[PDB]
Paper text:
Here, we show cytokinins induced the strong expression of the M. tuberculosis gene Rv0077c. We found that Rv0077c expression is repressed by a TetR-like transcriptional repressor, Rv0078. As previously reported, Rv0078 forms dimers resembling other TetR-like proteins. Rv0078 has an N-terminal DNA-binding domain (DBD) and a C-terminal ligand-binding domain (LBD).
Numbering used by the authors:
A (entry chain C), D (entry chain D): 7 to 200
B (entry chain B), C (entry chain A): 6 to 200
The structure:
Amino acid sequence: TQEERSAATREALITGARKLWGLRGYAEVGTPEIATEAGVTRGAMYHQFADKAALFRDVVEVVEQDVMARMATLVAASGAATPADAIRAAVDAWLEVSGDPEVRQLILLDAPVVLGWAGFRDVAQRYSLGMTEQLITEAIRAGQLARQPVRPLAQVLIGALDEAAMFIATADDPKRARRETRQVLRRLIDGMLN
Amino acid sequence: RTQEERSAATREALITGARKLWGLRGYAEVGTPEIATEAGVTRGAMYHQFADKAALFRDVVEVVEQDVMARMATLVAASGAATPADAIRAAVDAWLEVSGDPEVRQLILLDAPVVLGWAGFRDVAQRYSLGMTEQLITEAIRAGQLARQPVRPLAQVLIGALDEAAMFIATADDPKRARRETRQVLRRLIDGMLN
Amino acid sequence: RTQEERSAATREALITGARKLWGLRGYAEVGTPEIATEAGVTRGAMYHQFADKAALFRDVVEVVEQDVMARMATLVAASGAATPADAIRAAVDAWLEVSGDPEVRQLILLDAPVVLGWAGFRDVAQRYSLGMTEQLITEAIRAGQLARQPVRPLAQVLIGALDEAAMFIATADDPKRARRETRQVLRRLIDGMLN
Amino acid sequence: TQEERSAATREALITGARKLWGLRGYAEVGTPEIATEAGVTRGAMYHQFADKAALFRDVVEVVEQDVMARMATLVAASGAATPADAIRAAVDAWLEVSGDPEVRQLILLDAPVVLGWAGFRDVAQRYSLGMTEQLITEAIRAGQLARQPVRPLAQVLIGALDEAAMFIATADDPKRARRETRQVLRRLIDGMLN
DNA sequence: ACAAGCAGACTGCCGGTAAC
DNA sequence: GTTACCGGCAGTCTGCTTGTAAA
C-alpha cells in the first residue's frame, strides 16, 4: 500500500533517532547521520516529520510508553497489597528501569530542553507522571495518605525520582548508590504516609 | 589601562550579555554572533577569552549560581531561624522566592545539565546550592532533628524535588495557587522527614 | 529545467569562476566566499555540488588539463609531422605555445601537486598530457627512432624538464630570448635522445 | 645577552617548522602548532619573523644548504676525473639525497608555491641550481659538452631531476624505479655530452 | 625580546524550504 | 518520494597593536 509504506519509513527513522539520540544526545546527532542510519533520505524525513524537534516528539512518546510497559511489569509482579506498598513497588521499578542509559538521555536530559518543560509535561501526564498522580490519588482514597493537592505532590516526587536516577548512574560506586538512594526514597515515602 | 583589566572587562561584558540573552531564550537558541554584538565585542575577542561557546556558558552558570546563593542567604537571614530544622524550612521558602526568576530556571534548571552534562553541573553545584543542602542536612543530623542516613543521596533527591517544584509553579495556569499548594506539599514532606 | 541541468549549470559556473580567480592568484590566495560570489551562487549551494574546496579544485584541474591536451593536439596536427620523431618535436613546440597561458602554469605546474598530492595529480595527468607523453615515447620506440628503455620513467623526467622550461621562459627578464634559447636546449636534448 | 637569546629561539622555530612542515606540508601546519613545538609563543614568532612565509624562507635556506652539503660528500667520495663524470656523479648523489622525505616536501613541492617560482629560484641559484650552472659551464669549458645557453639547460635538467625524485619516492616498486630512472637519466646525460 | 588582547576572514557543516 | 539550494553558525587561523620586560 502507499500509506502503509509511510509508516515503515517513520518506524525506521524513529528507531534510528532513538538509538542515536539515546547514545549521544539530541544536539550531538544531526539529521544527516540519522537519515543515513535509518536507510532513507533527509527529504523523506522532512516530508514525514515537520522538523528535527517533531521527530524527537515521536521518539519521546515511544520511549515513555516502553518505560510504562516495563514498570507495570515489575509492579504487578511485586505483588503489593495496599496502595502504599504499590508506591514502594513503583519506586523500586523506576529504579530498575531508569538504569537504562537510553531512558536517562532521552527522557531525563534532552526532552525538557527540546519540547520545553510544559511540553514534555503534556506528554508525561499520559505516562509516568499521570500514573504517579493516580497512585497518590488511590493512596489518599484508601486512607493511607492525607488528603492534599495531588498534581504538586506527584510532580515533586517525580523530581526526586529523576534525580535519584542520575545520581545512581553517575556515582563512583553504583551498587552502594542504588542501595542508599533506595533507602532515602523509602524513608521519604514513609514520612509521607501514615 | 592594563591588560588584566582589558581581559576582565571583555569577559564581564560577554558574560553579562550571554546571561541576559541565554536566559531569555535558551542556550540552543542564541548564537555567538548575536551575543558578541550585544556585548559590543567581536567574535574573535570572545574566542580568545573563552575556549568555545560551552566555556562561556560555564562562566555564566558560575555567576548565576553564586547569585542564587546570595539571594537565598539574604532571605534566610531575615527569617530568624535558630535551629537546623528552621533553617531547612526557611531555605525551602527562600528557593521558592528566588526560583521565581526565569533566568534562573532557564540557565540552571534546564540548560546546564545538557550543556555541561549532568555530572559536570553537579561538580559545579557542590560548591553552591547543592553543597549548602549537604550542610543543612548534616547539621540537622548533628542536632538530632533528623535521622542519620546517607547524606549525598538525600541532598540530591531533595534538590530534584525542589527544582521540579519551581518549574511546576512557574508554568502553572494560575501561579499563585500553585505556589501556595506546592509550598504545602513541600512542607508536609519536610515535616515528615524531620521529627 | 531538470535537476541534472540545474546542478550542471551551477557546477559549470563555480568551475569557470574558480578557474579564473585561482589561475589569476593561486589556490591558497582565493577563498570560497569570493569564488561563490563570482559564480553568483551561495557558499551553501557550492558545498552541495562539491565536497570541499579541494574537490572543486580537482574538477578545475580536470577541465584545464583537457583544454591543454586539446590546444596541444590542434597545434601538432597543424605541424604536419609524419613520424614519431617529428611528432615529438612538434609536441615540444606546442607545449611551449600552450604553457604561455599563465592560468595553465598556475593551476597545473604549481598548485596541483600541492593540493592533490604528487601521486594524486600524477593519477590525473596519466589520463592526459602524461599519457600522451608515454604514447609518443612508446611509438618512438616502436618505429626504431628511439632506443628501447623503461617508458614511464623517461616520460615523467621529460615532463619535469618541459614544465620547468615553461616557468623559465615565463619568468625571465627578456622572454623572447628565453623562448629562443630554451627551445634550443630542448631541441638538442631531444636530438641527443633520438638517433 | 639579548642577541644570544634572540638567535636561539629562531633556531628552535626553524627546527620545529622544518620538522613539522617537512612531515605534513606548509598548508597543513599552523603557526600555533609550530610555536608549541618550538617551546615559544606566537608573539615571539611574529617578532622574529615577518609572517609564516618568512619562517618558511629561512627553513628553505637551511634545508637547501644541507642538500648541497650531503651532495658534496657523496660527489667527493665517488672520485670523478672530468667535468662530465662530475655531472654523472652529481646526479647519482642527488638521487641518494632526494631519498629524504623532508627534502621532497619542502624543496620540491611547497617552496615554489609558498615563495613563488621566481622567489624559490633566487634561493636555489646559490645552491643546487647555481652549482648545476657551474658544472655545465665547466663541462662546456673542457670540451665535453656543446657550447649553448647555460641558464636554460641547467634549469631544465634540474626539472628532470626533481620529477625523477618524486617518481622514485612514490612508485610502487621503489627499488626497480631507482634502477630504471637512473638508467634513463644516464642515457639522457650521455646523449647530451658529445 | 616577549606576551597578551584583538580583529577580519575562512572552511566545513546543519536545518529547513522549495522546487523537482 | 527526491534533489537543489539558502541563511547562518562554531571553531580556527593569521597578522596587527597594544601592553610588559630582561637586557
